[PDB]
Design a protein around this nucleic acid. Structure first.
Lengths: 101, 343, 217, 123, 131, 46
RNA sequence: AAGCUCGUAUCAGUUUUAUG
RNA sequence: CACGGACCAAGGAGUCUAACGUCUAUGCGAGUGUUUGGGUGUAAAACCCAUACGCGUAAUUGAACGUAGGUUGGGGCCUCGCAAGAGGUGCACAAUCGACCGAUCCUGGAUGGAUUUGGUAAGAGCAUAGCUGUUGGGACCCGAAAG
């Protein structure tokens, strides 16, 4: 589960972790909002996750749910972010309704 | 009963055929046990090495004792050659007898309990069922249609590598095969010239129930390894003591896994073996803590951070504002000054 | 079996399973059999619900799963002083199977999927006490339902059943009963017996005393 | 940010590191009981101790106020997008000039400060 | 005072993490005792035989008082009439598990017991002999 | 349809509201007690 | 260093009174 | 005082093994130890075990009449209560007194028992990994009159 996965990636050599000289464990995974490999931030340790990624000029809101854990080929869904900043923020808030702050 | 995993054809299409969860992936995951067992086992394939016993002894030297104002280390006799007068038999001497020579009877293999070995193998097998754990292992399984990956038994019948590699690419293993053959880097250190010249990352693991040619077809493609359900080598399932290898199973092998490792109906198929019992019912502690029953008998919590109080000591007798707080009578005191009262 | 399609990984197969079940369940004469089949069917429905983790679609599945109870022996008969013969006993088996499946597979629910099952149980409870006869009011039906429900969820004497489900029932009973729109058999308030039954879970007793008995209703 | 108070800027040097060439400058504690340095007699070289500990709020921060973070390629550089103010990208000495220009371009695009820009480059 | 578990088992670490929160937020000493015992070494956690549980179940009202063991439960052929009761322990041996289940009882993990009895009501903790 | 709030979130909000409804009254009680204590301290100091 | 109980009435390179 | 130090690059020393132990960790558990071997094998790799064997599972002949023990404390749990506290129930552990069955030491091959006696009491053990202690092997390294 998430707890077992979390503890294994934390104390059992997560492959994508980077150790900075200051002592902060980074995370170069493309699907993470933050580049820090802490709890509730690494996508592998949390079933529910949300992040923003772009391939073309368009920005996309990437999120995953337990409905697709069994099928990694369809793990992450995306929606056009309505690159108008004011509209984009409200769209993100509506999409993440009831999600963790 | 248990959930079911769809069987995928050699072209990537998910066949209607489905098999129940073998109940082996539900076994406890113990990284410590797996690491210890892997460390113990990896020393089994160790060839003994030792320094020649006759080395250093092939020298005639005796200590001069005293009176010559030189070190008492024994020195080779004779003369003319030049080696005469040089230290011998000393670990600190050039060309001497090294201290603590490595003997051939040093321990090389580590005894491991059979039950612990089976526990480690079961934990390694179970770890493969978690995509996140497999992703943390470095395998490019981001595009696999399903996990654990189940394929039709006809894969075992492939005789040509050209067809096996195409099937692996179609099913989704193309990313892992590309990762292999790319990380091939020349050995770092003195291993360059000890037959350990090249190294590469591990590729996908193929599990089969019967051998018909797949083992030979897949041996040539780098990174890909083939193993039988009966064996299920731990060194291959969790290379480097790290759990979560990308493993491809055949539906026939998926069914045979229940017999090989046992289930709730077939006990073990092994004499006296039984899957370890979990000591925790719910894997994640958050559900237990966040459960309604526990939360209903839990006192309220703070703001997650203690608010600093009295961060700086205000000194009375000055800063009248703080003085009034300590003693409200100070206002009445100052009303008449309370100090120049006339008798 | 039918459960195989309900627990399939393909959405099309899962939806077709429910579409066919909508008639397989209204085939009462076929389903008037042992409760083990009903338990297996509800276990399959448990996995079917488990396979959806999207807010709006999970509500769509939950509403139809709750309405399945009403679909079972739709009160078109209008049983004028007729007992549970071949009509209500079968639905009692389905209700028992639902609760057995929910209790057995409670801890297996992950943190994020807990809300889905809370919504599902809320919908099923709404369909219950709505469908005993054409409406709630029925002496024999209420007595049979109470005896076949009091002994499983709210017993509070057997620790085998987690007290979280009783807590949710306490929290949603009054909220859902008012949804039926003034007088009802609500004999159903079981809670007094739980309070009187000493040695029971103190947490459950406190919760029922606070949230339930404190209401003006 | 909080002031970067360096408790001991002078590099610690081993006793007699300059009197004899066979003694490396790397600090090593004197083991002899009669050693004056071990007894920290007045006028001797300062001995490292727990007192000189730098504060956490400013530890590892360069004078520019950005923490150093070794970067090997564009993938590593992209990880500092959310920590540009607190972290700065430092190119490794083994990076060929061919990739250095590409790394610098990405750093400029993301606004990540570079500790050692233009290394091995010519204009 | 021992404050951390030396065992490398992640499951035991999770149990300790849960029990620390339970003890700190409940105030019931029952959780504190179990949390402290969780740190006991293997030599300090002798197994509790099923015979010991059966003979301790003769206590008044023990039928409804679930027995709790912090160590491991081992079977005992010296008895054949194990009372029908629920036993909670970290690990249950095959023989002990069969005897408990065959007698109409149940076996649960420590987390299940904590969920059932967050305040430890009607609990009974048994400790194996050291002599 | 209107996306219903999570049941766990609803329970959390209800518990928070129930605790706040008592904390607010406790704040006023503490203020009154502090006023009375200040008056008593003033008279005692006099 | 590790285990039990107890945080309690357990003690004191301290002082004084009573038993010389 | 003295012992060594003209300087520098490299080299240089509590390492390995067998037995007996404490502690810690893992697996099983009244059972435990696959690997002396056999089967198998992508081959010193990897995976299984038929029969024996070491340990413990019980002995002053034999221990259920009873928590395979009354009482008193005793982590803990329950009722009373807003608290203080009262009552009920008690693991391990400690005091007291207890049951069978044998030796003192009487009694005359027993019999009844003098007063302490050592078991059952209620299994708690077997396998592997780590630091660590003693002994013998060159034994932290260098070195002496000899045969």
């Amino acid at each position: 589960s998430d707890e077992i996965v979390w503890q294994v990636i934390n104390q059992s050599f997560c492959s994508h972790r980077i150790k900075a000289p200051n002592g902060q464990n980074f995370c170069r995974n493309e699907y993470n909002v933050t580049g820090l490999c802490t709890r509730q931030s690494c996508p592998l340790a949390n079933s529910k996750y949300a992040t923003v990624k772009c391939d073309n000029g368009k920005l996309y809101l990437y999120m995953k749910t337990p409905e697709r854990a069994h099928t990694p080929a369809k793990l992450w869904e995306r929606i056009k972010l309505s690159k108008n900043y004011t509209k984009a923020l409200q769209q993100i808030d509506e999409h993440l309704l009831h999600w963790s702050k | 009963s248990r959930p079911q995993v769809t069987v995928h054809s050699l072209t990537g299409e998910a066949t209607a055929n489905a098999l129940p969860l073998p109940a082996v992936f539900s076994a406890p995951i113990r990284p410590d046990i797996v690491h210890t067992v892997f460390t113990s086992v990896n020393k089994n394939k160790r060839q003994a090495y030792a320094v020649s016993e006759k080395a250093g002894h092939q020298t005639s030297a005796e200590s001069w004792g005293t009176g010559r104002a030189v070190a008492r280390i024994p020195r080779v006799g004779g003369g003319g050659t030049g080696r005469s007068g040089q230290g011998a038999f000393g670990n600190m001497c050039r060309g001497g007898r090294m201290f603590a020579p490595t003997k051939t009877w040093r321990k090389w293999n580590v005894k491991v309990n059979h039950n612990e070995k089976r526990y480690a193998t079961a934990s390694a097998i179970a770890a493969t069922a978690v995509a996140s754990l497999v992703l943390a292992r470095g395998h490019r399984v981001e595009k696999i249609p399903e996990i654990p990956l189940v394929v039709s038994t006809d894969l075992e019948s492939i005789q040509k590598t050209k067809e096996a590699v195409a099937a692996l690419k179609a099913v989704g293993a193309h990313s892992d095969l590309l990762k292999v053959l790319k990380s091939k880097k020349l050995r770092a250190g003195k291993g360059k010239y000890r037959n350990r010249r090249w190294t590469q990352r591990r590729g996908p693991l193929v599990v089969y129930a019967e051998d018909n040619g797949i083992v030979k077809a897949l041996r040539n493609v780098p990174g890909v390894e083939t193993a039988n359900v009966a064996s299920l080598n731990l060194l291959q399932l969790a290379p480097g003591a790290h759990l979560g290898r990308f493993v491809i199973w055949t539906e026939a092998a998926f069914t045979k896994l229940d017999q090989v490792w046992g289930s709730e109906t077939v006990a073990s198929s092994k004499v006296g073996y039984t899957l370890p019992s979990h000591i925790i019912s719910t894997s994640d502690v958050t559900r237990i803590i966040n459960s309604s029953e526990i939360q209903s008998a839990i006192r309220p919590a703070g703001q997650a951070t203690q608010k600093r109080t009295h961060v700086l000591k205000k000194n009375p007798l000055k800063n009248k504002q703080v003085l009034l707080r300590l003693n409200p009578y100070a206002k009445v005191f100052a009303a008449e000054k309370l100090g120049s009262k006339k008798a | 079996n039918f459960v195989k399609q309900l627990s399939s990984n393909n959405r099309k197969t899962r939806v077709n399973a429910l579409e066919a079940l909508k008639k397989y369940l209204t085939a009462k004469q076929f389903k008037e059999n042992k409760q083990i089949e009903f338990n297996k069917l509800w276990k399959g429905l448990y996995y079917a619900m488990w396979f959806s983790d999207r807010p709006r679609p999970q509500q769509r599945l939950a509403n139809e799963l709750g309405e399945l109870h009403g679909l079972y022996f739709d009160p078109k008969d209008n049983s004028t002083a007729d007992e549970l013969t071949t009509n209500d006993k079968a639905f009692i088996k389905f209700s028992r199977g639902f609760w057995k499946v929910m209790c057995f597979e409670w801890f297996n629910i992950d943190r994020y999927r807990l809300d889905k099952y809370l919504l599902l149980i809320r919908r099923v409870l709404f369909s219950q006490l709505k469908y005993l006869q054409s409406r709630n009011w029925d002496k024999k039906l209420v007595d049979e339902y109470i005896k076949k429900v009091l002994r499983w969820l709210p017993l509070s004497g057997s620790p085998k059943v987690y007290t979280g489900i009783p807590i949710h029932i306490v929290d949603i009973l009054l909220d859902e009963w008012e949804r039926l729109l003034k007088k009802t058999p609500l004999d159903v308030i079981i809670f007094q017996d739980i309070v009187a039954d000493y040695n029971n879970s103190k947490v459950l007793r406190e919760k029922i005393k606070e949230d339930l008995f404190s209401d003006t209703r | 940010h909080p002031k970067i108070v360096k408790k001991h800027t002078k590099k610690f040097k081993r006793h007699h590191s300059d009197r004899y060439h066979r003694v490396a400058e790397n600090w090593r504690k004197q083991k002899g009981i009669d050693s004056v340095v071990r007894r920290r007699f007045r006028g001797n070289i300062s001995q490292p101790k727990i007192g000189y500990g730098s504060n956490k709020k400013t530890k590892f921060l360069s004078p520019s106020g950005h923490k150093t973070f070794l970067v090997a390629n564009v993938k590593d550089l992209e990880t500092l997008t959310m920590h540009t103010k607190t972290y700065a990208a430092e190119i490794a000495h083994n990076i060929s000039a061919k990739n250095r220009v590409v790394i610098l371009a990405r750093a400029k695009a993301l606004g990540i400060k570079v500790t050692n820009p233009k290394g091995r480059l010519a204009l | 005072h021992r404050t951390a578990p030396k065992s490398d088992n992640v499951y035991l670490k999770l149990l300790v993490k849960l029990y620390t929160f339970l003890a700190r937020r409940t105030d019931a000493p029952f959780n504190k005792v179990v949390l402290k015992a969780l740190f006991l070494s293997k030599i300090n956690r002798p197994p509790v035989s099923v015979s010991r549980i059966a003979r301790a179940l003769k206590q008044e009202g023990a039928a409804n008082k679930t027995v709790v063991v912090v160590g491991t439960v081992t079977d005992d052929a010296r008895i054949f009439e194990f009372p029908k009761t629920t036993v909670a322990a970290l690990r249950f041996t095959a023989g002990a598990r069969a005897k408990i289940v065959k007698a109409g009882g149940e076996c649960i993990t420590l987390d299940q017991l904590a969920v059932r009895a967050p305040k430890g009501q009607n609990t009974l903790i048994l400790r194996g002999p050291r002599n | 349809e209107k996306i219903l709030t999570p049941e766990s979130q609803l329970k959390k909000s209800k518990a928070q509201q129930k605790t706040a409804e008592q904390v607010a009254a406790e704040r006023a009680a503490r203020k009154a007690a502090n006023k009375e204590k200040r008056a008593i301290i003033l008279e005692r100091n006099a």
